[PDB]
Amino acid sequence: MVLSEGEWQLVLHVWAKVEADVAGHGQDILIRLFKSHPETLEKFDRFKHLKTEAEMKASEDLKKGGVTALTALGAILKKKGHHEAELKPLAQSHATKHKIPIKYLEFISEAIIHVLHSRHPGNFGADAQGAMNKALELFRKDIAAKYKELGYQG
Ligand code: HEM
Numbered sequence: 001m002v003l004s005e006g007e008w009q010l011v012l013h014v015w016a017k018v019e020a021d022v023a024g025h026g027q028d029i030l031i032r033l034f035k036s037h038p039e040t041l042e043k044f045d046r047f048k049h050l051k052t053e054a055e056m057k058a059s060e061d062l063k064k065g066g067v068t069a070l071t072a073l074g075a076i077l078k079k080k081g082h083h084e085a086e087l088k089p090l091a092q093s094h095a096t097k098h099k100i101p102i103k104y105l106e107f108i109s110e111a112i113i114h115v116l117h118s119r120h121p122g123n124f125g126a127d128a129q130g131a132m133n134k135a136l137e138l139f140r141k142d143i144a145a146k147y148k149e150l151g152y153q154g
Pocket of ligand 1: 040043044045046065072089093094098104
């Protein structure tokens with residue numbers, strides 16, 4: 001679909017708050033993902049052995065991974081839909097090296113929404129959440145199309 005500029009501004013205004021502390025937001029988001037959908041943890045060979053939330057919070061590797069993913073997503077969001085160049089390497093690695101189904105991208109999107117709803121009620125009311133959902137749906141739609149071009153059903 002296509003977001004309006006007003007919708008993009010709602011997305012970017014909450015993202016500005018994430019950027020006060022991307023590392024802490026990334027920890028919360030990955031922990032939420034792994035608690036809600038434990039099968040997703042199996043994809044992370046570096047830290048798939050972690051057993052508890054306490055171990056997850058203490059993991060420097062998990063923290064760095066959250067920073068990497070959220071920073072890449074932030075760069076995509078800041079393109080306001082003009083993200084073709086950014087999606088190419090990401091789709092290739094996630095399709096072919098990491099093997100991340102679209103369903104798992106849905107799960108991480110749900111975790112992002114959950115954490116922003118909890119942390120940022122001042123910038124994540126209903127209209128802002130709808131805008132973020134629309135941005136994440138666009139991201140997933142475009143990645144899914146690239147997955148198919150790359151030979152991965154997703
Ligand atoms: C918003 C969605 C996501 C973004 C923006 C994102 C971004 C990234 C980036 C930038 C990297 C490092 C470069 C690369 O390999 O492409 C990475 C690595 C990786 N991603 Fe994602 N990712 C997302 C979702 C996921 C999900 C849902 C999973 C698994 C359920 C996943 C699994 C992995 C794995 C296993 C790696 C390699 C990690 C390592 O080397 O320790 N990603 N991701």
